[PDB]
Symmetry: D2
Amino acid sequence: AENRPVALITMATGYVGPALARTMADRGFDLVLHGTAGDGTMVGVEESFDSQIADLAKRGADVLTISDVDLTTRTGNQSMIERVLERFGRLDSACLVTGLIVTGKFLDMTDDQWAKVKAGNLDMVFHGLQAVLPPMVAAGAGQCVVFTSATGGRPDPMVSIYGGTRAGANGIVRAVGLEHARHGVQVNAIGTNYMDFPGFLKASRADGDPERRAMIEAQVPLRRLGTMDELSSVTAGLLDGSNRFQTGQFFDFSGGWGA
Amino acid sequence: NRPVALITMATGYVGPALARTMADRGFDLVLHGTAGDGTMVGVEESFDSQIADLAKRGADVLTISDVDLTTRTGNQSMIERVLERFGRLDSACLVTGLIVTGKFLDMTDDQWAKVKAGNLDMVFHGLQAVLPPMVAAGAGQCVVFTSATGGRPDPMVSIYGGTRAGANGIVRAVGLEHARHGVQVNAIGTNYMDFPGFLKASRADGDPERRAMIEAQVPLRRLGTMDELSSVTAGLLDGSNRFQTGQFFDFSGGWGA
Amino acid sequence: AENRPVALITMATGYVGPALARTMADRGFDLVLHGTAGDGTMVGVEESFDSQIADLAKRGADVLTISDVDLTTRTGNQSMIERVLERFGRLDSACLVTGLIVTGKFLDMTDDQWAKVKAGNLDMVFHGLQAVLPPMVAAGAGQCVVFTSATGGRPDPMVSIYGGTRAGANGIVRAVGLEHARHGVQVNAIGTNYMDFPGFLKASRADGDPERRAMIEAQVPLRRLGTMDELSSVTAGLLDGSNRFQTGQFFDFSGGWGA
Amino acid sequence: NRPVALITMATGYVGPALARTMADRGFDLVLHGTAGDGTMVGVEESFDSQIADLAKRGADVLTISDVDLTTRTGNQSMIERVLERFGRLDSACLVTGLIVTGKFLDMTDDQWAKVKAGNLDMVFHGLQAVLPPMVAAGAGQCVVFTSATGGRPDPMVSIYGGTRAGANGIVRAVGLEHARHGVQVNAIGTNYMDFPGFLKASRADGDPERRAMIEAQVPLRRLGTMDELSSVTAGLLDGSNRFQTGQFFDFSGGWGA
Ligand SMILES: [Cl-]
Ligand SMILES: [Cl-]
Ligand SMILES: [Cl-]
Ligand SMILES: [Cl-]
């Protein structure tokens, strides 16, 4: 009877997940966090589920955690949404964080690297959207954000297959966001670059290297790395019901780099 | 002290709702717009009606109503009055444009002059006036309202949509050019918005059948509300997001996707 | 000796292939035609190799045909280019026709449909470019056109996974064209729609139906279907050495539909 | 009877090479340009230097000078002279623009007026003049030269690049709007072309060192040639391709990709 909306956030033990969960809880949502199990020492885990759950529960959110599902597959994504609906009976918002980073010269790319970028950058999008949309269509309302990459808006040398498949994800999102708009469902993509979190600081090798860090920031028009507080704010605005008038769109979030 | 937001054409369109939420977010306000009560032609919410409410929200308000924003003089004078009153300018929402439609080969020199003045001169002179105090302060946020037509200039909208695309291009360059000074400049272009101006021009006002026909042109099958638009606009003007600049955002229910 | 340049054209028994081969021969090229074996009464064969070879040889062009090789894989594309180089010792231009059409509601798409579109719209591009570029890089000059689809410039409802993956192919071409510009190797994409050839008439269901065809033509700003003579002229202009100053670009060729 | 192609600014830029290949392709020619010999400012191939070669290729040639193509009067006069001479206008190559660069906040009202006249008025009035005879005939092909900067309006090029984006938008709408009449209108935008206007704007003229620095900005690492550009341009004007309209083509060595 409380009629609390439910937001799914994937890869939620890092990147935008933790800050987005906090603000979605502040906005009255119950939460489903997909991510990697383990404590803060686990690789890729920036904020563990145990730490997040305690804070999110303090905010009044009910939280379901989902770990060790392979979201590059139909099975993983279908299982995830079945568990969402079992717990909460509804899905109002979904933040699908996708991707697998591969960089290098185009002619150096192997079949394995090609397979991996397709699995991360496209299969996660295809199967994720096939899983989250049915309950949204059934309800006549929903909001989805797919995280792709700012490289999808300008695929450049050394990120040919990563950036190119990100552009494909953006295109799928355009079609899908337009196709389900008549059912009250928004699907948009956000693509970031130059964000201050471990994943970026490693791919750019700015980690523990102030001189590298500074050269990287100088590549950004706004001369800084973006923060997860800023990104969670924009992302929540596309998932909290406050804006029901954009769909099928791609939003660059990279300090002007993808303008 | 409280940061200061300038909003133009603020007696209609997004202005009133944006003023309300910016006041909620802790800003003082400078409202440029049209003098008079709600019975005047352009006035959707009078200055008089807004001042009472915005003061209750904690905002000091300065109104400016006698300036032509197609010229250097009008915009320079507006910003001079902002700084005289509050000593700062943190955010600016510049609403621009003059609508002309019709066959390209029917457009007169006067129609061409007018769309350039509304769609381009207001942007050029507006940004030249608001940016200097922001650059001097090392921080600022600007949203220029152009049009969703700028993202897809179409038949029967050639000179309007085309000059809107030009305004978006100016915003791209200017937003990238002043990024190193901590200043953001972005553009928003709408269509199919639920406000009296569009309702009356489309004949959806008071006409449910016509409104349904108009909504059917929109992927999301509705008209956007000013509360929604003001939320998105304020998110680019309230300090919460300092990581987008030089960008154009379509806000038309998917119509410009 | 004669220093005749060599152009590869794939899927050349239909679509733009036959007209492009004629005009490239006229412009002084030797030709490698990949395609489907069989006479004109074969499915998908608009002009058989036998009929094309007679005419192309009359124009002075040497022709190598490459039949029944699968271009969705590394092995097929690598074998194709090995045979090009064994026969002619060079590859100056390549027209890579790619794709596999699937349409329908996004939520009706099966894993098999998804695999199929990825293989046609992305794997053919990845493996095709990995095969054709090395000899062009070695020579310090080359020109490539990848045929994707006008839907890649505007992925729409009912065309989500096809148009979206086409957008990804366009993005790969952008990055690859920019990345090999230092080697003098242009890589551009052309995306068509509403072309007067069987493949479109079937997907649109306008064949033998003047009313449906008239409805389809009315969706085109220029109010007609495009011809292979027009398309081959534009394509040859990106492959004949006359224009070496565009790369990484996508060109819509759909009567204004993708403008 | 030969079809007729109008080419403006034809004493420099793409004009001379385009005239040569359009003559080869069977066209008679109207060449608008600057009167005088090659020592005149901007004259790369004088009218006098071109005429013998063009006649040998089979073309009748009318030359036109001293019309202000930023105005309705000049463009209307030009097309009237085309029709009086040849009775038809099949193809038009409208070269437009006036380069201004510098910091946005340094731009004067005079600089703003000049870029609007060059980058927008030339397009508006040029298209209003060439299209009526093409629509009446049920066929025509037009290329408007804007700038590659219109695809990516950048710092230091704000009002030039921005208004070029507007010209591209006008061309999109107009190309779509007259497609039902069998008329194509497309834009080509160049940068990094090997001709005096670009060399001077980039300050690389007559200076191998600075030219190398400029070429380093281009993915294909050189300046484009007029033979290449005229090939692409003629392909949109020679009747061979009647299936693109309302489009913008970057021609800048990948710089605008
Ligand atoms: Cl990032
Ligand atoms: Cl609106
Ligand atoms: Cl087609
Ligand atoms: Cl140039």
